[PDB]
UniProtKB/Swiss-Prot annotation, chain C:
It is a multi-pass membrane protein. It comes from Sus scrofa. The gene is MT-ND4L. Its EC number is 7.1.1.2. Keywords: Electron transport, Membrane, Mitochondrion, Mitochondrion inner membrane, NAD, Respiratory chain, Translocase, Transmembrane, Transmembrane helix, Transport, Ubiquinone. This is NADH-ubiquinone oxidoreductase chain 4L. The chain crosses the membrane at residues 1-21, 29-49, 61-81. GO terms for biological process: ATP synthesis coupled electron transport. Its main location: mitochondrion. GO terms for cellular component: mitochondrial inner membrane; respiratory chain complex I.
Swiss-Prot record, chain G:
InterPro entries: ComplexI_Subunit6 (IPR050269), NADH_UbQ/plastoQ_OxRdtase_su6 (IPR001457), Nuo/plastoQ_OxRdtase_6_NuoJ (IPR042106). Core subunit of respiratory chain NADH dehydrogenase (Complex I) which is composed of 45 different subunits. This is NADH-ubiquinone oxidoreductase chain 6. The gene is MT-ND6. It catalyses: a ubiquinone + NADH + 5 H(+)(in) = a ubiquinol + NAD(+) + 4 H(+)(out). Its EC number is 7.1.1.2. It is found in: Mitochondrion inner membrane. GO terms for molecular function: NADH dehydrogenase (ubiquinone) activity. Core subunit of the mitochondrial membrane respiratory chain NADH dehydrogenase (Complex I) which catalyzes electron transfer from NADH through the respiratory chain, using ubiquinone as an electron acceptor. Essential for the catalytic activity and assembly of complex I.
Swiss-Prot record, chain H:
One of its GO terms (molecular function) is NADH dehydrogenase (ubiquinone) activity. GO terms for biological process: aerobic respiration; mitochondrial electron transport, NADH to ubiquinone; mitochondrial respiratory chain complex I assembly. Disulfide bonds: none annotated. It catalyses: a ubiquinone + NADH + 5 H(+)(in) = a ubiquinol + NAD(+) + 4 H(+)(out). This is NADH-ubiquinone oxidoreductase chain 1. Belongs to the complex I subunit 1 family. Signal peptide: none annotated. It comes from the Eukaryota. Core subunit of respiratory chain NADH dehydrogenase (Complex I) which is composed of 45 different subunits. Keywords: Electron transport, Membrane, Mitochondrion, Mitochondrion inner membrane, NAD, Respiratory chain, Translocase, Transmembrane, Transmembrane helix, Transport, Ubiquinone. Core subunit of the mitochondrial membrane respiratory chain NADH dehydrogenase (Complex I) which catalyzes electron transfer from NADH through the respiratory chain, using ubiquinone as an electron acceptor. Essential for the catalytic activity and assembly of complex I. It is an enzyme of class 7 (translocase). Its EC number is 7.1.1.2.
Curated annotation (Swiss-Prot), chain J:
This is NADH-ubiquinone oxidoreductase chain 3. Pfam families: Oxidored_q4. It catalyses: a ubiquinone + NADH + 5 H(+)(in) = a ubiquinol + NAD(+) + 4 H(+)(out). One of its GO terms (biological process) is mitochondrial electron transport, NADH to ubiquinone. It comes from Sus scrofa. Core subunit of the mitochondrial membrane respiratory chain NADH dehydrogenase (Complex I) which catalyzes electron transfer from NADH through the respiratory chain, using ubiquinone as an electron acceptor. Essential for the catalytic activity of complex I.
Amino acid sequence: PGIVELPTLEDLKVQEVKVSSSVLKAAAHHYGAQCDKPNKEFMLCRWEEKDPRRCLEEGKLVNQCALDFFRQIKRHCAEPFTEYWTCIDYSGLQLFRHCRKQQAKFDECVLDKLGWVRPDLG
Amino acid sequence: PFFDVQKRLGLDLDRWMTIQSAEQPHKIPGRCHAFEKEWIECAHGIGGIRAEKECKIEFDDFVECLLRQKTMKRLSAIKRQRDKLIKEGKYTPPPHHLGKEDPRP
Amino acid sequence: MPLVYMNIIMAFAIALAGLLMYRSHLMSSLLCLEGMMLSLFIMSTLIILNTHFTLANMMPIILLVFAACEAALGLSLLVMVSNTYGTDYVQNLNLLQC
Amino acid sequence: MWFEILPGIAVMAACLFIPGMATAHIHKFTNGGKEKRVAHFSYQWNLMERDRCISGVNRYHVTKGLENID
Amino acid sequence: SMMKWNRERRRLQIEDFEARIALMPLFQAEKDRRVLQMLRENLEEEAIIMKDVPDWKVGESVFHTTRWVTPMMGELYGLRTNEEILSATYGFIWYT
Amino acid sequence: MNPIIYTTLIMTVMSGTMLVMISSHWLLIWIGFEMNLLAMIPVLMKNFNPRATEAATKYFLTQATASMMLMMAIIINLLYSGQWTITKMFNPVAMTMMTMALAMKLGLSPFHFWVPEVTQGISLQAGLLLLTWQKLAPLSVLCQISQSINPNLMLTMAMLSILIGGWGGLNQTQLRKIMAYSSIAHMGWMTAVLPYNTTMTILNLLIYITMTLAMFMLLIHSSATTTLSLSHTWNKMPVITSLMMVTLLSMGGLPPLSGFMPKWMIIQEMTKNESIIMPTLMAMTALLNLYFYMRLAYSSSLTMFPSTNNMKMKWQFEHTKQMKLLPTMIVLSTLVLPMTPALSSLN
Amino acid sequence: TMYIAFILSTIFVIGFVGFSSKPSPIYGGLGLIVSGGVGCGIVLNFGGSFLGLMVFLIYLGGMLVVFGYTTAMATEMYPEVWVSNKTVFGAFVSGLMMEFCMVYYALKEEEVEIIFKFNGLGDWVIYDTGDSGFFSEEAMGIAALYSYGTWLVIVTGWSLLIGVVVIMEITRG
Amino acid sequence: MFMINILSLIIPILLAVAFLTLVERKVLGYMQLRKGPNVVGPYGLLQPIADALKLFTKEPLRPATSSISMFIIAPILALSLALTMWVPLPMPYPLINMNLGVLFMLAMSSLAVYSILWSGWASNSKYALIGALRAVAQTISYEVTLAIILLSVLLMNGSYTLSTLITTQEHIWMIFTSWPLAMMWFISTLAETNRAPFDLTENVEYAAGPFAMFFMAEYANIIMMNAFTAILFLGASHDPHTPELYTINFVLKTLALTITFLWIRASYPRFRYDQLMHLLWKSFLPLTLALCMWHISLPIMTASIPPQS
Amino acid sequence: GGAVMYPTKETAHWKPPPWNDVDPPKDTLVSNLTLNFGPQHPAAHGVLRLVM
Amino acid sequence: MNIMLTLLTNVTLASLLVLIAFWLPQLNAYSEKTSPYECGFLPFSMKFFLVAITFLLFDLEIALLLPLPWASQTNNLKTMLTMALFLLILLAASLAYEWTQKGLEW
Amino acid sequence: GRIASFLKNAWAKEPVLVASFAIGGLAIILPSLSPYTNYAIRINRATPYNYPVPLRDDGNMPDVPSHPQDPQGPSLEWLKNL
């Protein structure tokens, strides 16, 4: 039947968040709290349009907002964050429990400088 | 003699597993959930005789999702033409298809 | 269908052919019958996995259980027959005719 | 007396100790001096595959931090 | 003791799942962009390969419906290198 | 066998059939068939005999092969359709395989061979159960899939069943084997109209069940398994053999007995579908069934064979067992032709 | 190793020919153990870890071990291999030849059709691109038997219990 | 490097079995007021080497095997399965990490049973088959109870992953939670390996090398089963930075359990087949079923359902 | 009376089924094993033969 | 590939040892024991098979009991608990039947 | 009375079975008579295996939390206390 409509490569090129999984997991809780609105909007789009070719722009905003989130960390809490993710990186399962001391350090600075409050359980 | 005691007593004993579009544990979607949903919704109460012809398109697409026979045929044709071109030296697989260019995250 | 599905279905066909064409021992026929059950298990498992029929991943297990039950039955019949005759030869089952 | 058995038990103990130590050391040596990551579920493997792409050397052990961004 | 320990483990599991949920939208965005990129590359190279082929509508949907259909492994990594295909198919299963 | 255990096994057979007739999922239907087989083998071997063991083994082998083919067909239909409901099968090859399996379970020729042997091996009670209750589940499955049933294959199997049943019955002398071959022929009659009208199959099935119940119960009451052993019955209880004569004539289908109803309605439905050659051949071949029924009636009651001296002692004693259903079954299997318009109730 | 699944399926067919040739029971039982192990490998390759270990633990571990138990206690046979007397040897060779013809008609000719349509493309294509997250689809669905499939549990359990009863009644003499 | 890991798992286990022979000899002797091998090498350290060299030089006699083919496969299967069962075991990090390692172990033990059947059947010896079938019967009963106990104890682990057992027993050893199951499990392990009192003294047709390999496989299975018991019940502390601590503690636990295996061997008279099965069918099995009920109900009634992941 | 109503030459020799569904016991070979307690056996102390 | 490698290495190692134990040690010449396997000629007791069929059925029921650890994560805890207890009760009932009736003769 | 003697006789002769019946019986009665069973259900539901798909705000959903972490929405404080 019809020709599959596919977006051009140019319109799907976005600056990628080139961090490791351990780095993402260390800042995962804060990332969700800070970037909640853009992430939730994109999820709603993909869960209503049900087509990746309709929510490409929303995906871009998520990446851009994610980059801004890490940009603030670098300019305010660079050293404590490095300690946190490095500890998580070592653990094969990337367990949070093994790095609770480092987490407290990163949470404390981020609470003081950036004012971010880590989301609680559930 | 399908004594539909299930519907008479309003008890589900095996209807949960009849289709893959039914509720699955932890809301894990089926591979062809959308196609099966479309086919079932099309052929609801219109009768098997009418469903066989009227909802033919839905079932055809559903079967294509289930077995991917036509998709496999198309991909095989593409592969055959590509290999023929390679043998004649009329095609060069691009570096990203060769893996030279790093993938996107 | 993928070639793997073809091979499994062909395996079922071969086992059925062996079962229907007895040679001497009834034990060999039972082996062919159980092989067919194995082939059906593999076929159903692959189909369910590929379709992501999550709620139907329990079908192969139920098939396996009932398969081994009917086998327990076959073996019990085989030993009764062997104890009566002395061997499990299919030719021994000849009292009933037509 | 009874302590004469201890030599043989010690030799067997060293023999049994070799495997676990070898496994741990080889894991760390081949996984960038870190505990070998586990993939019990697809999400964990997806993180590994993403990490492999992020590294740029097709190795998941090397991890890129904030220095890689911007 | 096992009751208390298991309850704490459940709390930690919920925390880990929340971290996964927080990171999921970014991964979904990357996944969709990557899939579409691979599909486009395959489309362009398909045009180049089978342009000579008579009566070949490049990138013609095999389904009648215009609904988005999640691509199969062949539709994404069909013309990729064998090592990449092996990874995308059996990497997780063979990784032990 | 302990009576409680026997009751549990009988209920298990019934529950398997009920599951087959109650389920909407193919897997559950196959499960019901497996339960039927599992609970049927011990019932067949209630009276431990080498012949009983041979019959059980043959029955198990045939039913196991049938179940294997049935599950294979179900799996193929799942592969090509992703459906588990017992509806129109969406793969022709699966349809053919399932038809073969269900016919083997029924005993339709050319899968008839096991039926006479197993029937002869097992007891009269087990024979009754095998030839009446075990016919319900496969017929139910066939009725549910009648739309998808290939008319050509089913008609061929049914016609061959009628022919082979008649021929085999002509040569038999053992009462159980005669009953088995007649059962094959009647199953052919039942399945002939399956592609056309299922309600007629239900009607024929009910009449066949009543007739076979009456015949088997009369045989049990007379405790006879051969033509001569039944011939001796006239000296002791003439009523039983005369009622047997009536039931045999009904089984032949001679009007105005009940046996005419199923044949009459079947011919009606087949002629409505523009099929004239097939029903004509069916009746002309059922004449053979009538022939062996008439031979049995001759030996039993229409004529009197010599008896033995020991019969005098048996004259003094009276049968203690009382089969409550037998009178009603005899009446319903002989005088019900004035009640055909009740066919609508089946619909 | 892109066609590993196809190789396994061919070996599965070969083992099925081996035990379907009805050889000496001991040799056949092996023809089935080998095929069973291969089939488990195929299921694992598709990702059914639990089901793969199911056949290994139950079918191969118990069902075929009790089968071997019987062959050992009731041993009234002259041992022979699959490549023994022509009755078994010819059958094995012919089955292998039929399988090889199917394979050649399947690989050299992409659209092979004997009774069903088959495509010569590697089975890796049929695999679907998807993520289950922190899930084991197979395990979750099978565990749902206790939650969703209560009716299946009831029927299967009753069948098992009545099976024990039936086995005793049959093997009481 | 992975092949190096495989070799560093296989070779040390075989050497450990070889020295376990000497350890058993000496332990039994000193429990009998005797000195085990003490002449062949210092403290008998060269005794296993002497035994191996003598065996691989003794004239191998042929046992008229009905099927050399099968008679040769049985040793291969036993040894290969024994070696494979060590792979999933977490010494803190396992060689091959399986989400269902426990079921893999159970399946491997189940296949091992075939070695017994194949050996006796191919031996062409009435007494051999009888004894083999007795072994089949013994291993038959152990598998049921072993599986039930393993399932029940893993109901608090949260999965079949072997590595998770370390985390579950991080604070308290599992035995303190399931000690009756531990007792039945240990006795079932004794039954599995036919270690006394579940021996059937009086595959003997195997000569020298073949016998030696069967002996090695059996003793490797002994060590592996004791290791499994250790991981299941006697949890060990694991520091992610220094795994050697866990390795040492685990090895010590396994050695203690093997020493208990020998200690039982020279403490109790051998059972009788009827008694062994009237244990593994009429004493253990009902208790295992009841305890399985308890270990299903307990996590739910105490809100202690372990994490799935 | 007979196996079949119209018998053939081969079927003529064939015997009608027994009156009771009980086919006669065939051979009735004893399965009682005759084991020998070989002297080498430990319990025999090397000098004991127990035909059992 | 790792697990396949482990299986291959183990099997090959075992087979190599079997080679060096079946064919290498028999190379050494040890005269010839001209000793024939003097054979001059069946305990198919149910006592063995019964142990086997009952094991098969109990193993089948054990197979149904395997998915229990993952089944504890279901929200419908009451229903799952009831079904698990039902399966265990049926196992106990099967054992009781055999014990009460003429079974467990082993 | 008579039952009490039977239990004593049973434990004297077949203690293993008596224990098995008791443990099995408690493993059935105790679950229903336990308050933590309700909690065990809640914990299983609480565990967020899959993503909480957001819903489009229509302006008439006060209870539904349109924010990262504010009072609206479910609370896991009960588990934290446990």
